[PDB]
Design a protein around this ligand. Sequence first.
Ligand SMILES: O=P(O)(O)O[C@H]1[C@H](OP(=O)(O)O)[C@@H](OP(=O)(O)O)[C@H](OP(=O)(O)O)[C@@H](OP(=O)(O)O)[C@H]1OP(=O)(O)O
Ligand SMILES: O=P(O)(O)O[C@H]1[C@H](OP(=O)(O)O)[C@@H](OP(=O)(O)O)[C@H](OP(=O)(O)O)[C@@H](OP(=O)(O)O)[C@H]1OP(=O)(O)O
Lengths: 221, 221, 221, 221, 221, 221, 12, 12, 12, 12, 12, 12
Amino acid sequence: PVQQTGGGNYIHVPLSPRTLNAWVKLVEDKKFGAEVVPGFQALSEGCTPYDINQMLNCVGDHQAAMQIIREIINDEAADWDAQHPIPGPLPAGQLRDPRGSDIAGTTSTVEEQIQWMYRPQNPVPVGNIYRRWIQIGLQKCVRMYNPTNILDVKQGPKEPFQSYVDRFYKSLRAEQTDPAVKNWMTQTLLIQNANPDCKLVLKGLGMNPTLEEMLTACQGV
Amino acid sequence: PVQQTGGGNYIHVPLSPRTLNAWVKLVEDKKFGAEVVPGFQALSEGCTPYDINQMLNCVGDHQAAMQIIREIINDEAADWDAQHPIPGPLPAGQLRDPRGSDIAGTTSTVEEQIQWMYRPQNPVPVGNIYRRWIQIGLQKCVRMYNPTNILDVKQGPKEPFQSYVDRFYKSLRAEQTDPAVKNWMTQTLLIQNANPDCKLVLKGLGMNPTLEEMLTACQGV
Amino acid sequence: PVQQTGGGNYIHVPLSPRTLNAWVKLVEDKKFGAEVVPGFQALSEGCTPYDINQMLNCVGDHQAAMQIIREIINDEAADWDAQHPIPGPLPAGQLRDPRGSDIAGTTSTVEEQIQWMYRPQNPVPVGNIYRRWIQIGLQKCVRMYNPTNILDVKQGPKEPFQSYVDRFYKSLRAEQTDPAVKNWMTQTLLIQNANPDCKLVLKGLGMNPTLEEMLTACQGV
Amino acid sequence: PVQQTGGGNYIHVPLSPRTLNAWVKLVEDKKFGAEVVPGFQALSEGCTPYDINQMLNCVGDHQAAMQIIREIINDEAADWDAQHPIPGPLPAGQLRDPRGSDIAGTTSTVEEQIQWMYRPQNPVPVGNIYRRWIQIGLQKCVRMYNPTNILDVKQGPKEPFQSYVDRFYKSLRAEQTDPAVKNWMTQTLLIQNANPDCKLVLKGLGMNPTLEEMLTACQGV
Amino acid sequence: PVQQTGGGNYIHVPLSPRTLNAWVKLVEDKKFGAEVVPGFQALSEGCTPYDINQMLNCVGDHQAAMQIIREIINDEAADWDAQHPIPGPLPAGQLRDPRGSDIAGTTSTVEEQIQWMYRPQNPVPVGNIYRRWIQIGLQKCVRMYNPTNILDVKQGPKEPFQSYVDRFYKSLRAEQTDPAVKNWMTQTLLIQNANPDCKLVLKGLGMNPTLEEMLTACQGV
Amino acid sequence: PVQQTGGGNYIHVPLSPRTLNAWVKLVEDKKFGAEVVPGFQALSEGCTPYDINQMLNCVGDHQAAMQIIREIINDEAADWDAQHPIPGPLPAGQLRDPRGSDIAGTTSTVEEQIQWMYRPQNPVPVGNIYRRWIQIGLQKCVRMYNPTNILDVKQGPKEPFQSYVDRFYKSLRAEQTDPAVKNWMTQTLLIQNANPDCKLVLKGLGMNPTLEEMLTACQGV
Amino acid sequence: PVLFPGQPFGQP
Amino acid sequence: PVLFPGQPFGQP
Amino acid sequence: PVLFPGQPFGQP
Amino acid sequence: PVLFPGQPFGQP
Amino acid sequence: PVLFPGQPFGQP
Amino acid sequence: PVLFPGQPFGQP
Ligand SMILES: O=P(O)(O)O[C@H]1[C@H](OP(=O)(O)O)[C@@H](OP(=O)(O)O)[C@H](OP(=O)(O)O)[C@@H](OP(=O)(O)O)[C@H]1OP(=O)(O)O
Ligand SMILES: O=P(O)(O)O[C@H]1[C@H](OP(=O)(O)O)[C@@H](OP(=O)(O)O)[C@H](OP(=O)(O)O)[C@@H](OP(=O)(O)O)[C@H]1OP(=O)(O)O
């Protein structure tokens, strides 16, 4: 991560062992669930890329998913390389304008990444950019591990309603579909994929019933 | 959360992993009990909205309840938007007056939320406002999960009195009814929903018996 | 709680989640034993009333006991209100002289409670006053839960002496009786409520035997 | 405990909940073993008397032992009261010269105890004095609970030597006997209280055998 | 490790007991897995060689592996000794230019290692150099313990595909072979070492199929 | 331990309860294994003698070993007393030149030990000297508890090679024999104390085979 | 009555 | 509508 | 007698 | 290709 | 003899 | 040879 010192200078520090261990446990216990994408961010906020690399280099399992994360990091970088091309010769020995490998911490170091973050001009969040790319590869992995469908989910006659909705809104969160489609799915598909006449008890509500109204109407139905 | 630096400036920091984990455990073990509403506040006091979002984005379950929390956040904001409408053109590039999305941290950032909190004039508690809205949606959820009634509760002949009162005052706390009604319920309904003649032993006390007098009078009765 | 900043100013901070959790566990495992009254104080020393409220608002059980604590807080305040009545109109917008609700943190805020604690003149310990009132209601609760009597306790023939004394001095601590009565009870009742001739072995000691002399004299008797 | 602030002033702070919990566990698991006397000191070093009181007011069991500790605190104080008698009238409102109750924290407060510790002249360690008195009462208690005798200990034919010595040096530590007696006991009694001819194998060593020489000579004998 | 003090000076500090314990557990539970090499680095970042030595001197088991680490440290040093030979007589009593034993902390001390790190000129990372050498000996050990082959791995008919790939990419990481060979192995060997016709379902993809395309194509095949 | 304050002064502090507990657990779980000698050092680095005493006064068991540690501390001191004899009369009330009891903290205090460590001239590491003496007595104890011989160790026909080497290099570490003897033992005895023809498979290597070459050659032999 | 029966402790 | 149904809380 | 029998340790 | 297949993340 | 047999380590 | 076989790592 990064700290500050007298005079306005900044320094590098280590990533807490407690945070590294918590990242690993989140990956193992949740088996790359959707929850893993934000747990990573909170654990890594105020950090730098070198540390983000170590956390992802500690997980010794679910290694296929990590290759999926790697395929993504190489792409986003290529886009940045094209969008932010090598400027050319640089005056004196000034720090190089950041490129695809530098944001990740491969062709660079922590001191250079921290210097870029507070470069007097063009301070660049090298740390935040590499986490966004990483969250994209984690989300692809969360889907590959659990490819269950929102439509596939169906209610059971001796099975309650709250839990069916629970399975429904949890599956929808993982998806990366458009918000309006999510809105239609959460006002139509849920009423549709119920028990034969439980669809009717949900429809008792006049229209576009709010979920407070639907979770109370079918309590013990 | 927020910290301070030399010169009177303020900065942003990360939300402790210990606090995120404790929020999740409070939600899972208590299954969104009433206790969850204040555990959230203590864990999140001195924080900012972005962090409150991550804690609520980590819980991977009880996702229906979270949609109920969302339905609430969108409403309270709309009220604020109407009460605090867009002022109009703003001089130079000053920070925008906060709106419904900004208080939540969606159409904004942490640095802007912290700057608003110490804006030299009109310092606004963007963090506290988003927690109050959130506590309203959590309370709706606590009720949906446990919709047991204060009147429904009844004492058993081989069942003690202290525990019946325990179930009674715990159920009353969750309710959002008026205080005078709560006062009547705690001086009448409790004596009424007892065993056939245990109502009489409670009434032995001259009138409006204090709970110290009622919990001791029927000990081993 | 409270912290200090450069210039001599003071600020507010959050109550540790570790302390909130430890207060709850002390209440649950000891079932409101006498030990609970001081565990609360140590956990809450250097704190303010708002935090003391959250700790007591987190416990989701033993809710009847809490109502007993509330009946007490309302009384002690009324006494303070009478002893410290509203002075009258206050110059300019100075902070109001504290009243019954303010000491608890209900009709007030943390910043006002901290300002009172270091008010240049009449600095008032708003935090310590609300904890003393609370310790009085907790002690009433400790007694209601365990109403066993010091006299009720009796020794057994195949039961040892040290443990009987242990049950005796533990029960006496909970009581709120006068110290001289406690002194008489600890020099007479203990010798009296023994086995038929174990009373005699304790009396072998010339008179007013010290507990070192009594716990060694009847070892293996 | 105590902390320091700019200008050379000192303040009071709370006693860690982790330290209070560790003191209780040391008392419960070791059942007031000799180990308890120094665990208390390490946990309480840099502290003040008020905190030492809370730790000893949290233990809810082994209450008889605590009365033994109390009988001791009242005595040592009386000695101090006689050795350090009330001086007489004190100029202006200066802090009172400390007495028996003040060292314990009963007729005093933490701020007065901290002020005494750094009184510009006669700085007095009020904290260390009350811990020494307390360690004397704890040691009496350690003996009352385990009154096994160093001489009572005897070796077994199918029982090893290292463990017998272990029981021997552990029992000797608890005793408060003179060092020369301890030296004689550790060069004579140990050889004497062995198996019929194991006394001889220990004596194979020319004289006053060192324990390295005795623990190796009878290995597998 | 190292800290800084007023004036720009630097000091030495201890290595956290939590970090020493976590290094040992990583070695014991993972039995010197590949994960051990980076866990060591994160735990030891911002440290000095003396501390790295203690962590490796605490592990009381897997001692053969440690000798392998030692054989490596002696070699890398010899190379440095040759590359950086003793300069000759040094002016006054200036600190000696570092040699093979000094980087490890054997013929030196922490204060000398910290002074070298901030030597006004030629500041040398004595700490980072000794960790790189150590990571080379750990990697040799990870291979000796688990010498399973990437080619040896084969899929089972009732065994899934994701897990086979998991065993494949985990084994490849441990290897120290060239990257292009790793690329060929991850685009050919994996399709080859499958079930008799599962090789064909993977090949359904037109060519050089990306792992996202391969892990989804054979889901439930 | 020791801390620093403004002006260049130094102070004393307490030893962490976490460190005291970890020292005890290292002694109990490893039963005074070789690992105990360095765990002690890491836990006690930056400390003073008084604290080292408390840690060793908390362990309530393995008390015979501690007497062995004591026999050693008294000797090393006597040597220091002779090497560093009482100088004679000291000017004014200057702190006494340290002696055998002072280095241990018996005839001295922490403030005097800290003052010696930063004595403007002849700053003496009173803390490090007492730990080296202590590590010598711990090593004698590690040997007394586990007196198994490097030569005594023998391989089994259905027993693997890596583990035999593991038992061999672990036993050698505990020994305090010369390094060249250790080198001969690790290039000869290990090949000798194998299975009847496993000695030959190890010898397949041309000569002085490195342990990497020996641990791989006999894998699955 | 500062805290009415059943009222969560603290600000109203 | 600040947070659309199913939208992870926080920035878009 | 600083602490009377059964008196919680500390201030009265 | 910043990170080649199987390459530990971070500096080469 | 700095520490006599059985003497708790530290100050007398 | 910086560290001889079996030599505890660190200062001699
Ligand atoms: O170790 P960290 O990741 O920095 O976490 C700290 C740290 O925890 P430990 O006690 O486990 O080491 C503090 O202790 P120190 O490192 O400063 O000794 C502790 O507070 P104490 O010092 O009182 O033990 C504090 O606990 P809390 O969260 O209850 O304030 C805790 O906090 P975080 O885990 O939130 O960082
Ligand atoms: O980091 P620490 O302060 O050392 O505490 C953690 C953990 O607590 P935290 O994660 O909250 O810090 C344990 O508590 P739990 O989380 O398991 O409840 C705690 O032990 P206790 O349960 O007895 O409090 C133990 O440290 P310590 O014993 O010094 O308190 C340690 O455990 P882990 O390293 O396994 O997280």
